[PDB]
Design a protein around this ligand. Structure first.
Ligand SMILES: *[C@@H]1O[C@H](CO)[C@@H](O[C@@H]2O[C@H](CO)[C@@H](O[C@@H]3O[C@H](CO)[C@@H](O)[C@H](O)[C@@H]3O)[C@H](O)[C@H]2NC(C)=O)[C@H](O)[C@H]1NC(C)=O
Ligand SMILES: *[C@@H]1O[C@H](CO)[C@@H](O[C@@H]2O[C@H](CO)[C@@H](O[C@@H]3O[C@H](CO)[C@@H](O)[C@H](O)[C@@H]3O)[C@H](O)[C@H]2NC(C)=O)[C@H](O)[C@H]1NC(C)=O
Ligand SMILES: *[C@@H]1O[C@H](CO)[C@@H](O)[C@H](O)[C@H]1NC(C)=O
Ligand SMILES: *[C@@H]1O[C@H](CO)[C@@H](O)[C@H](O)[C@H]1NC(C)=O
Ligand SMILES: [Ca+2]
Ligand SMILES: [Ca+2]
Ligand SMILES: [Ca+2]
Ligand SMILES: [Ca+2]
Ligand SMILES: [Ca+2]
Ligand SMILES: [Ca+2]
Ligand SMILES: [Ca+2]
Ligand SMILES: [Ca+2]
Ligand SMILES: [Ca+2]
Ligand SMILES: [Ca+2]
Ligand SMILES: [Ca+2]
Ligand SMILES: [Ca+2]
Ligand SMILES: [Ca+2]
Ligand SMILES: [Ca+2]
Ligand SMILES: [Ca+2]
Ligand SMILES: [Ca+2]
Ligand SMILES: [Ca+2]
Ligand SMILES: [Ca+2]
Ligand SMILES: [Ca+2]
Ligand SMILES: [Ca+2]
Lengths: 439, 439
């Protein structure tokens, strides 16, 4: 009817207590038989002495106390029946109770010998991150008592050990104490150590890995800020113009880049295609220099981050000239010489070095492809003389003057064909006529 | 019945000849009427004098002599009838003939005031190239007599004027006297001048253009002889590896280049694609560094000439490592400790710092992705000690030794789980077990 406090895991045949403190007398005509708790306990039979056995009483692994709360003790009950050896025929039944005293026979440890914590790279100082707890099958001071953060020099002054001391359970926590930057270090090796509070203390150690996640904190940047390239007029579709490239220090989709035309006039969009993945600018239209000599635009690199960061680069492509236009001869009336549908009305009186018509010839190409030379065909008395001076210009003009004295009778009409050709390869030629009619 | 030689284009009423040399007498009872050649000739009627008219006799443009050969003269016949004025009733019929003497009234000229000759750029010295002839409506010395080649300084000492003097006709010819090279000059401006042989002489001048055709005499050349590039393991299909570029000084199809793998092992062909037109090498397979750390090959640029000229360029791509392989834990028997299906048979006698098994852990990645750390899980009396020294190698090995004194009774069997993790981002972990059974 009284309780007996006993340590667990005692050695066999350890005296727990004597019922001498109870009502019976020592070895006095009473048989002490045990009826309950047979596996663990054992009685002297003659005396009221209780003893242990070779089946060690284990607080941690005994049914009676498995799902228990911290405050409650581990109890196992027993029933010792005493029968008077004087043949009196009425056994007494003494109910008894054992409170198992705990002892530090279990080590605290973590579910896994390694722990992986994931911390965004620009988390503000003071941020907390929980660590998986260590469990101790023991109770009281023999349970989890204190953690400790063992880290290297670099890791020190970045991470600290703060512990929520909530009566529920020890909550360990990693406090961020410095700025992280995945583009500098993306892995840290901490070591966490746990101990229990009974002496001598038990301990465990798990490796705490801290990897840092990527934030889109870096925008893309182009190899060089601006791009130059040349491209031949009338190039074949698919011909490669230039390749633009930018790279981003981030990781994953925060560094995956896509290229797109930024503020490109329609005229350029029609003629150029920009492969968004490879950043390759190729031709997709008729590159005609005479329409546009040089095309300018800016390309945009955008990383695939949720809040994507941009980057701009200027690019200019100069179009190299091709000889795809022939010279053009125009004939018009100089001074008082009216022209109409390619005809002229002249008298045979003013006949020497007299300008009849003014011819201007011009070629839309560049340089040697517009270096035009012009002459008069056949045998007709009309010289082409240098009209005026534009320097060394590609377009020139000539006085179409007379070289002979004319007479209405012998010569009646004319048909003059002027021929022009450019110094190209292949060369291009044009011809234009003029029927000077005399009166 | 006699012939009369007369120049053409005479002035009207020019005395050609008198029939006084014939049988009749001057103005003696004979009427001289003209019956043939009315348009051009005219007779005095009283005398036997023949005269011209205002319809000028033209050798060049008269029907009687159009399709004639050089030797033949221009003839026109006439019939003068004489009737005796003494009423004798039997007219005599005098047949006569005029040979038109030629005079230099026509200028030699070319069909076109400009002539375009096409000369391959590496034609050997001495090669001949015909020039269109000049035509002269005149005949004899009044016809084409001599050409002349008027050229600039640069053109001089490259081209000469040689003339086939075949009795058929003057054949002008341009003789090549120096090496041409379209990659140096692709256009030349000669001037050809023709004259006739009657004095004063007539002349014409046509511009003779000489353009040079392209021969595939230049092979392509790469921007730089060799190419380096980096490429991340397991890159997405289509990702741009590098762009190779070569250019050729020729023109047209002799400079159009196509790029193809030259002597590339199949392993590289499976993983890389080379766009033959743009020369862009992109990814088309699983880039696995552990299979090949760096891929080397050579690319070929071939111009589209009929006899195409080649160009080779070496290229090496180093594969950047990714953490796509987890560490591997192997457990094997050290010394006299036989292992079988992950078991061991040990006695509790040798118990302190006694190697039970040998563990070797290794990661196929590189650097931090193979920087492995290894530990023992849970609470079990077995320490991992540094087995031996490979320096700072990525693969390590540990003695799996005992840390406590064992006894067959209290401890009966074990299950040890070794855990390994690499210093990657993300990190990869592996685990391997070993059931050491005691006897
Ligand atoms: C994004 O692109 C830029 C520009 O290409 C990269 O920066 C460049 O990286 C190369 C490779 O290391 C550097 O080459 C270095 O050159 C110096 C001499 O200039 C030499 O001493 C080194 O041994 C090395 O060969 C280059 O200097 C550097 N340029 C700049 C302006 O930074 C950048 O690395 C790329 N991004 C990533 C994530 O790789
Ligand atoms: C085929 O590609 C080669 C290599 O890119 C071209 O040769 C290069 O042409 C550029 C453009 O003129 C040259 O730039 C020059 O640089 C010098 C200083 O190095 C500067 O003083 C000049 O004003 C000019 O900017 C470059 O030097 C030259 N490199 C070599 C090795 O020749 C070549 O032109 C291309 N083929 C064709 C037909 O264009
Ligand atoms: C020349 O005069 C005729 C006569 O009326 C006229 O029809 C023609 O248009 C004139 N041409 C020029 C160029 O003056
Ligand atoms: C241990 O001994 C048992 C007994 O036969 C045997 O079956 C087993 O294979 C042995 N294992 C080792 C690792 O020696
Ligand atoms: Ca216990
Ligand atoms: Ca404990
Ligand atoms: Ca305990
Ligand atoms: Ca950062
Ligand atoms: Ca980042
Ligand atoms: Ca980014
Ligand atoms: Ca054009
Ligand atoms: Ca052009
Ligand atoms: Ca032109
Ligand atoms: Ca007149
Ligand atoms: Ca004539
Ligand atoms: Ca002539
Ligand atoms: Ca003549
Ligand atoms: Ca050449
Ligand atoms: Ca060539
Ligand atoms: Ca070529
Ligand atoms: Ca791989
Ligand atoms: Ca790898
Ligand atoms: Ca790895
Ligand atoms: Ca023993």
């Amino acid at each position: 009817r009284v309780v007996y406090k006993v340590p667990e895991e005692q050695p066999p045949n350890t005296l727990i207590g004597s019922l001498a403190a109870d009502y019976g007398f020592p070895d006095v005509g009473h048989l002490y038989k045990l009826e309950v708790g047979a596996p663990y306990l054992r009685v002297d039979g003659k005396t009221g002495d209780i003893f242990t056995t070779e089946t060690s009483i284990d607080r941690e692994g005994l049914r009676e106390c498995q799902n228990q709360l911290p405050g409650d003790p581990c109890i196992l009950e027993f029933e010792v029946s005493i029968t008077d050896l004087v043949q009196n025929g009425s056994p007494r039944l003494l109910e008894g109770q054992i409170e198992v005293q705990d002892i530090n026979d279990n080590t605290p440890n973590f579910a896994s010998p390694v722990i992986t914590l994931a911390i965004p790279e620009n988390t503000n100082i003071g941020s907390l991150f929980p660590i998986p707890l260590a469990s101790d099958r023991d109770a009281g001071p023999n349970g989890v008592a204190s953690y400790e953060l063992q880290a290297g020099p670099e890791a020190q002054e970045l991470f600290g050990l703060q512990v929520a001391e909530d009566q529920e359970e020890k909550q360990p926590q990693l406090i961020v104490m410095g700025n992280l930057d995945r583009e500098r270090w993306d892995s840290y090796d901490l070591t966490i150590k746990v101990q229990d509070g009974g002496s001598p203390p038990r301990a465990s150690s798990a490796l705490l890995r801290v990897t840092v996640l990527d934030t889109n904190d870096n925008a893309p940047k182009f190899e060089r800020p601006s791009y130059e390239a040349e491209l031949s007029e009338n190039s074949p579709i698919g011909h490669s113009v230039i390749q633009v490239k930018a790279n981003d220090s981030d990781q994953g989709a925060n560094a995956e880049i896509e290229y797109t035309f930024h503020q490109a006039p329609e005229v350029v969009r029609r003629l150029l295609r920009l492969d968004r993945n490879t950043g390759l600018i190729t031709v997709q239209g008729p590159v005609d220099r005479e329409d546009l000599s040089t095309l300018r635009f800016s390309v945009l690199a955008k990383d695939r981050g949720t809040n994507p960061k941009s980057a701009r680069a200027q690019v200019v492509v100069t179009v190299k000239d091709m000889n795809d236009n022939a010279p053009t001869i125009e004939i018009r009336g100089i001074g008082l010489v009216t022209h109409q549908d390619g005809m002229a009305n002249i008298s045979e009186d003013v006949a020497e070095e007299t300008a009849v018509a003014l011819v201007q010839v011009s070629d839309r190409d560049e340089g040697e492809n517009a270096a035009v030379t012009c002459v008069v065909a056949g045998d007709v008395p009309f010289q082409l003389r240098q009209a005026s001076e534009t320097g060394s210009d590609s377009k020139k003009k000539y006085f179409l003057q007379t070289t002979t004295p004319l007479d209405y009778e012998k010569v009646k009409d004319y048909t003059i064909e002027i021929v022009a050709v450019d110094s190209g390869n292949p060369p291009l030629s044009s011809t234009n006529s003029l029927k000077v009619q005399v009166v």
